[PDB]
Amino acid sequence: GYTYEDYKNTAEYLLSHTKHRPQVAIICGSGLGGLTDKLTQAQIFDYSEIPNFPRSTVPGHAGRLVFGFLNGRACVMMQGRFHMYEGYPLYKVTFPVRVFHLLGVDTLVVTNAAGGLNPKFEVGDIMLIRDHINLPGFSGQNPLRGPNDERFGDRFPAMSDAYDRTMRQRALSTYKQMGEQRELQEGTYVMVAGPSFETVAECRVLQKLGADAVGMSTVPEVIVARHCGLRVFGFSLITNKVIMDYQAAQKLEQFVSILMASIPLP
Amino acid sequence: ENGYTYEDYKNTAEYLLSHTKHRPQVAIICGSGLGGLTDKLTQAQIFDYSEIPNFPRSTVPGHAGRLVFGFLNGRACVMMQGRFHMYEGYPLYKVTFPVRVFHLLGVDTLVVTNAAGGLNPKFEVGDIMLIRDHINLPGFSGQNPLRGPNDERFGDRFPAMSDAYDRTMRQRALSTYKQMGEQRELQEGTYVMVAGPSFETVAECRVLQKLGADAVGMSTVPEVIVARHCGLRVFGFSLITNKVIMDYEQAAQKLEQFVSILMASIPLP
Amino acid sequence: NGYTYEDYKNTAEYLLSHTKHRPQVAIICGSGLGGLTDKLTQAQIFDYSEIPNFPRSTVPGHAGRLVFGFLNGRACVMMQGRFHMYEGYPLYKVTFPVRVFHLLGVDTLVVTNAAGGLNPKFEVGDIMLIRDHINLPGFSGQNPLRGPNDERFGDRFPAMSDAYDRTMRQRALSTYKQMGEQRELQEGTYVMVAGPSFETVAECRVLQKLGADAVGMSTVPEVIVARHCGLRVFGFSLITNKVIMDYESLEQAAQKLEQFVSILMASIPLP
């Protein structure tokens, strides 16, 4: 759908309309828009004013980028993210990530809301994402499917090192600082397309496959991000324990904000 | 994604409502080899799919397929004789189009039937499996009939499916079958949908078994999802027509009758 | 399916009227296996670009030539390079050649690929005789037989449980043992994933748990279409890497297979 030039035009629009130069892009998942409250010097672009940006036909959720500083670090936030279940093809779901790269961003933080599959997780837990399982990807729904563009990356990029080891260590180490009751969980995120929720038998499948949390987003963006060389890390907020038998948001937002200090300099 | 507007459904509902006097409470979708169930209908009135607005039909004549209104065991109902499959090339919003029409007709209950291959070793050809749950493999990957913008006149953006197969109807079906008298028990288990149309390899069948599927086929799950999305009560059955190979080494009429009997045990609107 | 029956026939007629070669056997050469065309005698080459209705190999290393000739005296035709879903091709394109071959009068299809080893006992350089497959794209809808079935090619619901020919399997095992080699000929299940990005550790564990012995991004669609039209099928993966199954932190073989396929031409039964 999009050409290299389309991404570049969008990026140049943004660059000539703000003096902000973000090092870090952050995608806010459901219930996590509150992260934009922590930016200083906020400049806002509604998705509808940005050339080439996907928008929803559905009213209500407008969708926006907000540029600012988070804990002293220059960043851009996506408030309102695109999902496969809404009907967007994956190249639109992940369009913004390639834009961020052309903006100069070297780090992508991904957040989402997910169903706990690991019995020891509780509602309100934060799961540091260690790895993923791309079920749509197995069957053909991969955002890199089609001709490859070497201005972005390789034809066959590796994903085994997708979730940055350094950020993982610094996150485990930092979370201990925050005097929290429960430890920071860690585990594997599985994407399913949705939009209907999982049956019990489906949840047992996902658990047997080794998944600790399930949701309907994030993975396509991680893949495109890694294709073009961005450092990636992220977190799932566990908003339910899925059924296997027949304030927490504000905490994650504050943790993400503290972690900016740990992102390496450009 | 969805190529139908709300109006399209409504027009198809209006057309039908104005061309029959029947007012079904229950819809029934007849799977392979179960078209005979329309024989048991009293005061039948037939609509060929081809004469119904917006309805899918084959590009291949030889089959038109048909909708039949009537009373089954005294219960007002409508029956799909001939269902659609993903493997024929239909998108899932066409496969499941009838279900939203039924909802607009005033139906509040959907009964689904199919022919499935048995994966549970203790099943036998001719068994009836009461559908307890499903595993939607196409849905995992993106092929879910709710994909696209959600229309709140039908349902929520994110409907639960964990309670999809009505528990009350399950209990009554188990109770009822026991009092009819047959050699073999009413089976119960998880249906797994795969797209087909090719049949499964031994390695694939083993995968399906390890995942906890009891029976496998190529239909039904989409219709159930859409039914639950617009709030219909759902239950259904698989007829085990073969036992799938896991190593490199009359039953229809019985189901038709059992369904007929069970109309009595369906709650009122 | 965007192709009519006539599109297949026209492509076949074009070939039948531009070569006098009449192959019994088609062979699809995977990544790194194009050198198998070297062993043909009396070779006639068509570029895919000059063949009506034919798709293009966009992956470097997949040459994009249809080569007719004799291999160990057997009349065959070789796809030097193949097509993949990850390139952006729908499966009816990926598998277009298989039906052409059928109309050419071919009765045996040989599939080869480069694959990742999921079985711990495999090694880089091993050849795995394909015993069975797991079609993950197929579970979800991506099946080349999707759409109206044409009975001029085959049935609506063809079986795949006997896809990899038992006779050829036995003769392959038997023949390799005569061939004297350090490693024995491996045997196992091939799982197709779409790609193009490589698997995560957790994804490799999934594929192992499903019972797959090797993984790649091709072949299965071709086999399904071949079986649909009744062709005899067998095939091999060259294990080019052992996929990583654990988290780790600091804190010639092609020619062998090529030769072996050449030798096995003499075990293919005649028409």
| Residue matched to tokens 């905490």 | A251
Q: Which residues contact C11 (CB under 8 A, 6 or more apart)?
A: C51, C52, C53, C54, C96, C100
Length, in residues, of chain C: 271
Q: Write the burial class of residue B63 (CB in 10 Å: 0-12 exposed, 13-18 middle, 19+ buried).
A: exposed
| Residue A63 sits at the chain C interface (C-beta within 8 Å) | no
CA angle (A194, A195, A200) in 5-degree steps:
65
| Residue C199 sits at the chain A interface (C-beta within 8 Å) | yes
Do residues B57 and B80 lie in contact, with contact meaning Cβ atoms separated by under 8 Å? no
CA angle (A192, A194, A195) in 5-degree steps:
165
Do residues C218 and C82 lie in contact, with contact meaning Cβ atoms separated by under 8 Å? yes
Question: CA-CA distance, C44 to C108, in Å (whole number)?
Answer: 20
Upper half-sphere CA count for residue C199 (Cβ side, 13 Å): 30
Is A196 in contact with B144 (Cβ distance < 8 A)? yes
For residue C4, give the DSSP letter.
-
- Angle, in degrees to the nearest 10, between helices C96-104 and C5-16: 50
Closest CA to A12 of A55, A91, A4: A4
Q: Write the burial class of residue A147 (CB in 10 Å: 0-12 exposed, 13-18 middle, 19+ buried).
A: exposed
Do residues A237 and A182 lie in contact, with contact meaning Cβ atoms separated by under 8 Å? no
| Residue B56 sits at the chain C interface (C-beta within 8 Å) | no
Question: C-alpha distances in angstroms, C264 versus C70, C183, C239?
Answer: 13, 18, 19
3-state DSSP assignment of residue A110: strand
Do residues A29 and A117 lie in contact, with contact meaning Cβ atoms separated by under 8 Å? no
The reply to whether A9 sits in an annotated binding site is no
Binding residues of C for phosphate: 31, 62, 82-84, 114, 218
Is C200 in contact with A146 (Cβ distance < 8 A)? no
Is A86 in contact with B149 (Cβ distance < 8 A)? yes
Q: Which residues of C touch A118 (CB under 8 A)?
A: none
Give me the resolution in angstroms, 1 decimal.
2.2
The closest CB to that of C142, out of A132, A140, A211, belongs to A140
Do residues C25 and C232 lie in contact, with contact meaning Cβ atoms separated by under 8 Å? no
Give me C99's structure tokens.
Answer: 């039906």
Question: CA-CA distance, B214 to B198, in Å (whole number)?
Answer: 19
Q: Which residues contact A79 (CB under 8 A, 6 or more apart)?
A: A28, A33, A36, A63, A64, A65, A66
Do residues C106 and C98 lie in contact, with contact meaning Cβ atoms separated by under 8 Å? no
Give me C203's structure tokens.
Answer: 């994804």
Question: CA-CA distance, B233 to B231, in Å (whole number)?
Answer: 7
Distance from CA of residue B85 to its chain's centroid?
11
Give me A189's structure tokens.
Answer: 């995120």
Mutate to test the interface with C, among B58, B140, B204, B248 (most CBs of C within 10 A): B204
C-beta neighbour count of C69 within 10 angstroms: 20
Do residues C123 and C178 lie in contact, with contact meaning Cβ atoms separated by under 8 Å? no
Question: CA-CA distance, B64 to B47, in Å (whole number)?
Answer: 10
Distance from CA of residue C49 to its chain's centroid?
21
Domains of chain B listed by start with CATH number: 1-269 (3.40.50.1580)
The closest CB to that of B207, out of C157, C158, C211, belongs to C211
What's the count of helices (H) and strands (E) in chain C, helices before strands?
8, 9
Closest CA to B215 of B252, B180, B188, B181: B188
Type of residue found at B251: A
Q: Write the burial class of residue A120 (CB in 10 Å: 0-12 exposed, 13-18 middle, 19+ buried).
A: exposed
| Residue B250 sits at the chain C interface (C-beta within 8 Å) | no
Closest-CA distance, A266 to chain B, in angstroms, reads 37
Do residues A75 and A259 lie in contact, with contact meaning Cβ atoms separated by under 8 Å? no
Mutate to test the interface with A, among B96, B131, B146, B147 (most CBs of A within 10 A): B147
Q: Which residues of C touch B200 (CB under 8 A)?
A: 160-161
Question: CA-CA distance, B81 to B38, in Å (whole number)?
Answer: 8
Q: Residues C196-205, buried b or exposed e (16+ Cβ, 10 A)?
A: bbbbbbbbbb
Closest CA to A66 of A32, A28, A36: A36
Question: CA-CA distance, B242 to A59, in Å (whole number)?
Answer: 49
Question: CA-CA distance, C1 to B88, in Å (whole number)?
Answer: 11
| Residue C70 sits at the chain A interface (C-beta within 8 Å) | no
Question: CA-CA distance, C151 to C229, in Å (whole number)?
Answer: 9
Q: Which residues of A touch B143 (CB under 8 A)?
A: 193
Type of residue found at B166: D
Is A201 in contact with B210 (Cβ distance < 8 A)? no
Q: Which residues contact A5 (CB under 8 A, 6 or more apart)?
A: none
Q: Which residues contact B104 (CB under 8 A, 6 or more apart)?
A: B9, B10, B12, B13
Q: Given the DSSP bridges, would you call strands C74-80 and C65-71 parallel, antiparallel or unpaired?
A: antiparallel
Closest CA to C200 of A242, A162, B237: A162
Q: Which chains touch A (3 or more CB pairs under 8 A)?
A: B, C
Closest-CA distance, B119 to chain C, in angstroms, reads 15
Give me A175's structure tokens.
Answer: 């979370």
3-class SS string, C123-191: CCCCEEEEEEEEEHHHHHCCCCCCCCCCCCCCCCCCCCCCCECHHHHHHHHHHHHHCCCCCCCEEEEEE
Do residues C135 and B204 lie in contact, with contact meaning Cβ atoms separated by under 8 Å? yes
Q: Which residues of B touch C135 (CB under 8 A)?
A: 201, 204
Strand partners, A43: A67
* Experiment type: X-ray
Do residues B70 and B44 lie in contact, with contact meaning Cβ atoms separated by under 8 Å? yes
Question: CA-CA distance, C29 to C45, in Å (whole number)?
Answer: 15
A144 to chain C: closest CA residue: C196
Find the DSSP H helices in chain C. Answer: 5-16, 91-94, 96-104, 136-140, 166-178, 201-209, 220-228, 253-264
| Residue A159 sits at the chain B interface (C-beta within 8 Å) | no
Q: Number of Cβ pairs closer than 8 Å across B and C?
A: 88
Question: CA-CA distance, C84 to C112, in Å (whole number)?
Answer: 13
Closest CA to B192 of B208, B207, B206, B168: B208
Is B162 in contact with A199 (Cβ distance < 8 A)? yes
Is C196 in contact with A142 (Cβ distance < 8 A)? yes
Binding residues of B for a purine D-ribonucleoside: 87, 200, 218, 242
Closest CA to B194 of C238, C160, A122, C167: C160
Question: CA-CA distance, A228 to A106, in Å (whole number)?
Answer: 10
Q: Which residues contact A205 (CB under 8 A, 6 or more apart)?
A: B135, B211, B212
Do residues A10 and A50 lie in contact, with contact meaning Cβ atoms separated by under 8 Å? yes
Length, in residues, of chain B: 269
| Residue C85 sits at the chain A interface (C-beta within 8 Å) | yes
Helix, strand, coil: what percent of chain C each, to 5? Answer: 30, 25, 45
Question: CA-CA distance, A235 to B264, in Å (whole number)?
Answer: 51
Do residues C192 and C217 lie in contact, with contact meaning Cβ atoms separated by under 8 Å? yes
Q: Which chains touch C (3 or more CB pairs under 8 A)?
A: A, B
Do residues C95 and C222 lie in contact, with contact meaning Cβ atoms separated by under 8 Å? yes
The closest CB to that of B195, out of C131, C143, C212, belongs to C143
Is C200 in contact with A132 (Cβ distance < 8 A)? yes
A165 to chain C: closest CA residue: C249
Is C224 in contact with B198 (Cβ distance < 8 A)? yes
Question: CA-CA distance, B4 to B10, in Å (whole number)?
Answer: 10
Q: Write the burial class of residue C45 (CB in 10 Å: 0-12 exposed, 13-18 middle, 19+ buried).
A: middle
For residue A147, give the DSSP letter.
S
3-state DSSP assignment of residue B130: strand
Element (H, E) at A7: helix A4-17
| Residue A244 sits at the chain B interface (C-beta within 8 Å) | no
